[PDB]
Write an enzyme that holds these catalytic residues in place. Structure first.
Site, PDB file in Angstrom:
ATOM      1  N   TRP A 218       0.768  -1.396  -0.101  1.00  0.00           N
ATOM      2  CA  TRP A 218      -0.002   0.167  -0.197  1.00  0.00           C
ATOM      3  C   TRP A 218       0.972   1.257  -0.213  1.00  0.00           C
ATOM      4  CZ3 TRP A 218      -0.501   4.196   3.201  1.00  0.00           C
ATOM      5  CH2 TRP A 218      -1.332   5.077   3.034  1.00  0.00           C
ATOM      6  N   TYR A 222       1.149   4.133  -2.948  1.00  0.00           N
ATOM      7  CA  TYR A 222       0.510   5.490  -2.550  1.00  0.00           C
ATOM      8  C   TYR A 222       1.828   6.594  -2.657  1.00  0.00           C
ATOM      9  CZ  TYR A 222      -1.520   9.342  -0.193  1.00  0.00           C
ATOM     10  OH  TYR A 222      -2.004  10.699  -0.039  1.00  0.00           O
ATOM     11  N   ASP A 238      -6.317  -0.214  -0.603  1.00  0.00           N
ATOM     12  CA  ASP A 238      -6.741   0.940  -0.062  1.00  0.00           C
ATOM     13  C   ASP A 238      -8.175   0.788   0.667  1.00  0.00           C
ATOM     14  OD1 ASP A 238      -6.573   4.155   0.379  1.00  0.00           O
ATOM     15  OD2 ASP A 238      -8.664   3.678  -0.322  1.00  0.00           O
TER      16      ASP A 238
END
EC number: 3.2.2.21
Lengths: 282, 282, 282, 282
Positions: A218, A222, A238
DNA sequence: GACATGAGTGCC
DNA sequence: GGCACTCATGTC
DNA sequence: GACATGAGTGCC
DNA sequence: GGCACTCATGTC
């Protein structure tokens, strides 16, 4: 003072809104007509003020005297932050329906990849507003204050967080593991191991990024999205995304998200911001 | 028709001359009143033209059309190549005697760390003019020619060169060992392992560069100096440098150069372009 | 009770003296007619007594009852420590005059490679008598005591030293780096990374030991000689050896010893125990 | 000739039955009253013959003339193969009911871990009988033939198998990744990366082994069991073991087996050779 | 969310 | 039965 | 100039 | 002694 161009449409309210929600106290300042923050380029420092001019599709940048010597780098950082490079016709044309509701949508980047890296990590598990609270606390404690503008404080540099006590950071409101990750990142930044500009092979660079402690899939995604402004990465892990795809395993969402190549990053943003979006009833 | 500031004095004649000698055919065009080159940023491509305005202590940068979307980063690139941040009153106030004769000296940057990396390697052992013509061939076989300025051509990219067959490269006129050096450097650039901007610990980042195949201390030092525009590196292993310090060993030379910290890079350029310079009785 | 035979001639006087100088108080007891020490084989512990009977060129081995379940292993260990496999004819035959004064010469092995590993490290720099004392303090603090033999103590195991406090070992009178070396060696033994039996490729094997912190070429070579009882290694780096070859450097010494292959380990011992010896100035 | 003790009871019928099915032609011979095989200890070769003596609770070992210089090491090899160290009252105290039916069960070891590694591999996904013939082909194609006993060939050394054509092996009757494995294992042995004796940390050592090409968790486990004679391992991934635990998952088996610590290796054997065995439904 | 454990697919 | 790819658990 | 051996020198 | 750093020397 300085001015840069952009192609219409550009949804400046959405963009400022998005930045405003994550803004860090003492570092940034967001209003409906401008954006402004502290900024360091090497040991040059000051305040940058950005003012859009909807009328003429131009963004005016102002730099306090301290940043003048590196003005161009300051402009570059601003253009990556506001995605002035985007050509909505290409993107909205490729996303069709998904983008029709907000064709002015842009990818909110960053002004410095290290900072974005610290930001992404602190944003783990917690709320958007909560991470801003935490980032603010970290900045307050490790960031330099601007002599010429005491109201503003520079985001903590790599060398400072590198020389910080894990316990001290833990005390700010995060697990030991989280703080250990911050310090690790600071060192990579010092050694020149944390890519600051987008790499040629984003997928590979993200895999490498994932070996870093405290940085999972993640966080690497990001970070690739905001820190590198990588335009083709989805966030199948997410929180909000899992809700837009009710009952769907990460690999499923990733398979679904493939229809949006090579602008997955933009599709991601449209989904996050489409209140009642739902996968095609097919 | 963009514009950037610089602090006087600035010896353009000297700078343009330095770039002139190293100009790689089709890629850059260097003349008395302007500099121009092919420029790639992601996949936006075009031609940059820099025209100094001594009168207004300003630099006028003009971009074609395929670069306007990313104008700011282009501007940042030229400001690094031309050392626009330099405060000569500060460097000379420190170097003293050594820099009184050419107070307008600047540090010749680069527009991209990967390119500079390739030029560094392709300039090992051979003469300047030689390295230029050679480098020009590589750019010839891997360059992305512009459909708006076919005369110009983009510098090879890491991926376009990471997929290059050694033999094919060697055939251009370089040992195998070195042709391999490129290919490697290209991969490192692909996965973000080659710092594209100056790192916090410049010494460390250089040590890490030295592990690379085909890269030794002289190459790393030189890469840092031009690729990162590191201001405090000296090149004690350099051919010309050894002659300027007759009979001295790398360590002696380095011991001596400590008198110019933290501007050893400027110290180096002054000593390099000063035929007959010799060290003191110190 | 148990008996193992050997090949005449065997200089027990020398073998016992050598082992006598290096004996570790509370672990070994070396007399003029017998050798004895504590011994562990897994969780089997006890005392071992070896009595050499020249008359019948045989070695008599007695084992405390705690070692009886693993008698053979104890026997193989005594045979590795006393080089009972040696064929003096072959070595003395391929060494000529060098091995004339003392043909009963044998290569002093060990009873455990990890132990010999700890001895080699502690044997660095200091004198034999100091190493012995030093090793003695390590034994006293980390060793296992035998319930049936309170006078004796088992040599420290990897499990204990791996968990040791760097500062504790330091306090015994050794540089920190040396104690860290010991703790790393122990972790390797636990992990299975320490060749406890001679490997087929001693060169590769030693080069691999030298990556261990605290272990250099000397230690590796010496470990191979005693701990693996490798028969073909010299110590051109040895102190006493440097004096046996005045003016010569490692490689020169190393080129000289090639003559004695493949029994360089033996040659080394003789040149070691012949104060007069000096090379044949080619 | 030589004699080694063992504590009763000892099920020789079973042990020989075990080794006899897995016997490799030309390498070893197994009969109702004895066991024998070729044996190489360094540059010494010969035939070892083991004859149990139930009356005296003892094992008689005979060595051909070529293994006398290293007799003790030979004896130690035989003791690890026949598990003479075992105290059945202890293991059966612990195991309780499970081994009540065959209190004389022993852990069939090996005389060399390398050989055992090779055996462990060649015996993957095949039948006992097949592995035997497959291994024999390898033994023959790469072994050492004893001059004094022509029908006997020493098992292949690490050197020989390291330099073996990865196809001449596939030829004998095995896949490619099968010959990769052997060849890798062989190099590991040459350098000393393959633990030749049981490591203080079995779990960790096994983890490392699992990184080996062709060596998975099952192999690593079985290798610990026979090659190091580790006594507290279990094989939940074993085919036959799964059937003994109808349905159950490789971690529930593991969970159930924990009840036999620290003698899981013995428990394993009993379960293997007790067909109608099924776990407690409780 | 990062990370180690465990499972069950599924292919050479 | 080695081995790459997922999901589902369960502390931190 | 990169890069092996290969000795010296100076601190741990 | 270990080891990082330093100064040839020879090769490609």
């Amino acid at each position: 003072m300085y001015t840069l161009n952009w192609q219409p449409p550009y949804d400046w309210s959405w963009m400022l809104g998005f930045l405003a929600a994550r803004a860090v106290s003492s570092v940034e300042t967001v209003a409906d007509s401008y954006y402004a923050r502290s900024l360091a380029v090497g040991e040059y420092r000051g305040v940058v003020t950005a003012i859009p001019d909807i009328a003429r599709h131009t963004l005016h940048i102002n730099l306090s005297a301290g940043l003048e010597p590196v003005a161009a780098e300051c402009l570059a950082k601003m253009s990556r932050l506001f995605d002035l490079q985007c050509n909505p016709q290409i993107v909205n044309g490729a996303l069709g329906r998904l983008g029709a509701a907000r064709p002015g949508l842009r990818l909110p980047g960053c002004v410095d990849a290290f900072e974005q890296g610290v930001r992404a990590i602190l944003g783990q598990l917690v709320s958007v507003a909560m991470a801003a609270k935490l980032t603010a606390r970290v900045a307050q404690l490790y960031g330099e204050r601007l002599d010429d503008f005491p109201e503003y404080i520079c985001f903590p540099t790599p060398q400072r967080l590198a020389a910080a006590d894990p316990q001290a950071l833990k005390a700010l409101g995060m697990p030991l593991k989280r703080a250990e990750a911050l310090i690790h990142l600071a060192n990579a930044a010092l050694e020149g191991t944390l890519p600051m500009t987008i790499p040629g092979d984003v997928e590979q660079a993200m895999k490498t990024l994932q070996t870093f402690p405290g940085i999972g899939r993640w966080t690497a995604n990001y970070f690739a999205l905001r820190g590198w402004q990588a335009k083709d990465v989805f966030l199948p892990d997410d929180y909000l995304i899992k809700q837009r795809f009710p009952g769907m395993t990460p690999a499923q969402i990733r398979r679904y998200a493939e229809r949006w190549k090579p602008w997955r990053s933009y599709a991601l943003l449209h989904i996050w911001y489409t209140e009642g979006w739902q996968p095609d009833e097919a």
